[PDB]
Every structure is written in structure tokens, then in C-alpha cells.
Design an enzyme around this catalytic site. Structure first.
Site, PDB file in Angstrom:
ATOM      1  NE  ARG A 140     -12.402  27.039 -20.988  1.00 33.12           N
ATOM      2  CZ  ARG A 140     -11.869  28.212 -21.267  1.00 33.12           C
ATOM      3  NH1 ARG A 140     -10.367  28.239 -21.457  1.00 33.12           N
ATOM      4  NH2 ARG A 140     -12.432  29.650 -21.048  1.00 33.12           N
ATOM      5  CB  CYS A 160      -4.922   0.869 -16.126  1.00 29.20           C
ATOM      6  SG  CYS A 160      -4.373  -1.080 -16.936  1.00 29.20           S
ATOM      7  CG  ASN A 182     -10.259  -0.615 -16.163  1.00 30.45           C
ATOM      8  OD1 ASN A 182     -11.068  -0.018 -15.115  1.00 30.45           O
ATOM      9  ND2 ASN A 182      -8.892  -0.933 -15.446  1.00 30.45           N
ATOM     10  CG  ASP A 183     -10.233  -8.515 -15.907  1.00 30.86           C
ATOM     11  OD1 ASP A 183     -11.537  -8.581 -15.890  1.00 30.86           O
ATOM     12  OD2 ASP A 183      -9.427  -9.246 -16.076  1.00 30.86           O
ATOM     13  CG  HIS A 221     -10.284  -7.155 -21.524  1.00 30.66           C
ATOM     14  ND1 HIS A 221      -9.768  -7.767 -20.828  1.00 30.66           N
ATOM     15  CD2 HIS A 221      -9.468  -5.871 -21.952  1.00 30.66           C
ATOM     16  CE1 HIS A 221      -8.401  -7.144 -20.653  1.00 30.66           C
ATOM     17  NE2 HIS A 221      -8.472  -6.085 -21.197  1.00 30.66           N
ATOM     18  CB  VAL A 222     -15.011  -9.943 -18.920  1.00 32.33           C
ATOM     19  CG1 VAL A 222     -15.638  -8.787 -18.575  1.00 32.33           C
ATOM     20  CG2 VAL A 222     -15.704 -11.037 -20.037  1.00 32.33           C
ATOM     21  CB  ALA A 277      -5.310 -15.787 -16.210  1.00 33.43           C
TER      22      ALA A 277
END
EC number: 2.1.1.45
Lengths: 278, 278
Positions: A140, A160, A182-183, A221-222, A277
Site C-alpha cells: 500500500r 500540477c 487544473n484548467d 477553474h475556468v 492569457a
């Protein structure tokens, strides 16, 4: 378990339940007016797949090639030098290239480190994870870790998808993955399928059927400008996932090449531009 | 969001959907017959709490005291020497005491390391996490990491709850936690509430309302002998969670003492013996 169903199951949630970063002085911005670009977000979301199909968007094309290529660089080559990744035709890293060519003590440089003891001989994360899987399946502890508290200040960028946890249960190999951020608009679909490739690869070499594929996101998020464009993607058509091919003649992790991976009959949507961006 | 509701929501799942470790030659065993003890398990489960109440079992008593005590040792004292933990009356670590008194390069020893750069002066994980929270709340990097790939071979034991990810959204502090493994029968209830205490503590000192409390388990399992005993716990009564107290007069993380924590009106079940196992 189409990646589409769950993907849009998370997008609307963000547009509807996400919280705007507004309250803060973000540093990131668009490129048409310098105006700081703003986002909406949710904490802790999760995508699971039984592996009956390839987790890949069909309402848009993914960098399925550039994706596997970057995978070999980090986990196969265990390189941090950008030239190696430039040799594969990929340039999407050129931005964080340091005066010496590498991205510092991150990513591949963390996996190549010969930091573990294996039979009176040091070895690295990737080599350790390998042997134990077939000689200590029940364990484990099968864990790879990119987030090094010791060399964080030394990486040219914070990772990330930084860790993974594998399980060997009933001739099956299960892979859990986690992203601190994470986008969903430009980063997620690429990462997901990508770390699922890595799974299929070790699966074949260790000789174990594929178990559940689980992907964990912390901050999801976005960007605002990306919203109006994601709503269309949602209503786009949904075709059946492709049939990723992988040369079965391979028996060693370091034998794989970008030429052993071929996505067969991949139907996907059309071009969707998502404002740049910094 | 009683811890009970979700707790048993995970136990039955394990008895019903869990996979036996059987197929393997486990090393761990009971103590009445040496017979290797065996378990059932599930991969990736998660418990979330809105913080309207203390996540603590009420169908059984938790080591709420020994729990917070061990918390100060790791995060406050950042000590790996067992004597310090013996000074608090706790002995449940005496087993992994090394010839020098400590447990090696794990737990507290990972948090005390002055490995980060903060204004031309090195600092440790806990000190770094602190300053940034009130001067860089928006940051998507608030992460503590125990799993050190560099000193894993140097710890006298591999940590369970090894990392955390905090978020500062709308005057609220959210805490996500993850365990690579966790015994739902003897390890989980103790860990959970325990890492929720840590949350309430930094919350108060940083001056931010409490956000969602999320706890992640990788490998969740229970031992066979423990099953028949868990079924009773499920049917046991469920009282209302207590009202944990914390001296509001404190304004510094390192000012807290085991005397600032008092669980008020804690109704819990009766004694339930769960067979010992090396």
C-alpha cells in the site's frame, strides 16, 4: 465512462457553483487588453473511469500526440532539459526554459533521482515503482511524488499532476492521480488522457489487467472569457471514443516510442478558440 | 454532516464491495493464534464536512485527547523524538522508537526542516504555510508534504496522512487532507477529527472563517475479525456531536497547549474491543 459525460458534468458546476477569484489582485491576464483575466472555481472534484474506453474529449480535439510525447519526457526520459522536449517537436515549454536549457529541479528531474535503496544499490522513483509492482503488488505504498519540499525553491515551476498511487488488486492495476490545480478549459483534457496512457503502458509491461482510472483535481477553474465558449462545447455532438493502439511486442518500459501509440478512428468536434492569457 | 453518517456509509461499502487481500502473503497477523489476519478493501473514498459540527464518532469514543496531543507533536513541536511524545503521556509510538529515541526522518522532522526561502531567510513548511496564508491567500500552492522521496529510506515508518492543501476563498479557509492508507476500524476516526482540529487552530490564528473540511483516503480497509464488530457499531445510537472549545485568547500557532482544547457534552457509545494485530 466517456470523458465527455463527466467533463461537462464538472463545467456547468463551475459556472453555476464556482467562486470568482475577483476579490484578489490576480497576476495573470488576457492578451488583447492586458486587463487581468478572471476565473470561477470549485474545490476538490473527481473523475473516475472503468477503462472500457479511452478518456478523451470528442467534442474537441486533444493534443493526444503532444500529450504522450510530454509523457515520455517526464517518465521515460526523466529529463528536465527542454532541448530533449524540443527534439520531439514540442515547444510548449520554451517559456520556462532556464539559461541552461532546463526547467530546474522539477518534473523529470524528480523521477530520475537515484534516491531509493534496492538490494544494496540506489535507484530512482520510476525504477522503484516498477520492481515493487511485480514483487510487492499487495503493498500500500506504490507512490511517485513530484512535490519535493526540499527542491521546490529550485524548480522553475510548481507541478500540477504531482503524484500517483497505484494498486494491484485481482490481476488488476488501478491508477489514482492528483492535480493541485487544473484548467478545465485548456489543461484538464490533455492531462487526464495523458496520465491514463502512462497507466496502460506500465499495465502491459507488468502484465496486469487495467483497473479503475481515477483522476483528482484540487482547485478546478475556468477563465471567464472561456465560459461562453465552453457552453457550446457542451451542446456539441458526442461520438464514440477511439481505440488507442500500443505495440504489444514491447516488454520494457524504456522501449516505448512515440511510434507505438496510435489512436484509431478518433471522431472529435471542431476548432474552438480560447483567448490567450499570460 | 455527522462523521457517523459518512463513516458507516463507507464501512458497509467495504464489507459489501471490498476486495480481500487474501491472494497475498500478508506479514501482519492477529495475536491469539499468529494466524495472518486478513482484510477487505476499496480504493479512493472521500469524506467532506461543512464544519457546522465536529467530525467525531458518537457510536464509540475517540482518543480525542491523545489525538490533539499527537497533533502538537508533529505540527507544533515538529519533533520526531519519541521522548517528547512520552512527556505528554502518549506511548502509542514506543513501538517505532529508534536506538536514539526518534522515528527517523519522518513526521515532525519533515515539517521542521528549514527548507524554504522567505525574505532572504530560510524557513520550514509550517512557517511558510503560515505567512503565505495571510499575505498570499489567493495562492493555489498552500501545500505541506510529508512524503519526502529523498528521505523515505530514512524514516522509521511511512506516513499515512502525508499532505494537505488549503484554500482561502471568501474569508473562508478550506482544508483538504489525504491518507495513502487508513484503517476504518482503528485509524480513521482518530485521524479525521484530529486533522480537523489543526484546521480550526490555524483558522483562528489567521483570522479566517472555516471552509469545507475534506478528507481523502487511498486504500481503505478493515480487518476481517473487525467486521462482526463494526456491524454493531452501525446499529448503535447516534447522539449529537459535542462542542469543541478552543481558547480564543490565543493569537499564535505556537501558543496552543493541550489545555486549550475541551470537548463539551460529548455523548458516545460504549466499549468495543477490536482484536489486536501486529
Amino acid at each position: 465512462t466517456q470523458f465527455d459525460k463527466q467533463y461537462n458534468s464538472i463545467i456547468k458546476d463551475i459556472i453555476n457553483n464556482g467562486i470568482s477569484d475577483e476579490e484578489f489582485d490576480v497576476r495573470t491576464k488576457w492578451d488583447s487588453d492586458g486587463t487581468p483575466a478572471h476565473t470561477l472555481s470549485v474545490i476538490s472534484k473527481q473523475m473516475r473511469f472503468d477503462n472500457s474506453e479511452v478518456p478523451i474529449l470528442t467534442t474537441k480535439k486533444v493534443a493526444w500526440k503532444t500529450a504522450i510525447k510530454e509523457l515520455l519526457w517526464i517518465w521515460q526520459l526523466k529529463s528536465n532539459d527542454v532541448n530533449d522536449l524540443n527534439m520531439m517537436g514540442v515547444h510548449i515549454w520554451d517559456q520556462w526554459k532556464q539559461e541552461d536549457g532546463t526547467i530546474g529541479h522539477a518534473y523529470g528531474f524528480q523521477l530520475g533521482k537515484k534516491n531509493r535503496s534496492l538490494n544494496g544499490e540506489k535507484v530512482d522513483q520510476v525504477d522503484y515503482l516498477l520492481h515493487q509492482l511485480k514483487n510487492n503488488p499487495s503493498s500500500r505504498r506504490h507512490i511517485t511524488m513530484l512535490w519535493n519540499p526540499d527542491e521546490l525553491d529550485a524548480m522553475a515551476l510548481t507541478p500540477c499532476v504531482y503524484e500517483t498511487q497505484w494498486y494491484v488488486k485481482h490481476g488488476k492495476l488501478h491508477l489514482e492521480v492528483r492535480a493541485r490545480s487544473n484548467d478545465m478549459a485548456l489543461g484538464n483534457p490533455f492531462n487526464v488522457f495523458q496520465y491514463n496512457v502512462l497507466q496502460r503502458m506500465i499495465a502491459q509491461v507488468t502484465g496486469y489487467e487495467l483497473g479503475e482510472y481515477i483522476f483528482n483535481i484540487g482547485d478546478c477553474h475556468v477563465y471567464t472569457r472561456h465560459i461562453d465558449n465552453l457552453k457550446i462545447q457542451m451542446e456539441r455532438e458526442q461520438f464514440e471514443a477511439p481505440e488507442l493502439w500500443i505495440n504489444p511486442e514491447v516488454k520494457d518500459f524504456y522501449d516505448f516510442t512515440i511510434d507505438d501509440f496510435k489512436l484509431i478512428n478518433y471522431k472529435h468536434g471542431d476548432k474552438l478558440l480560447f483567448e490567450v492569457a499570460v
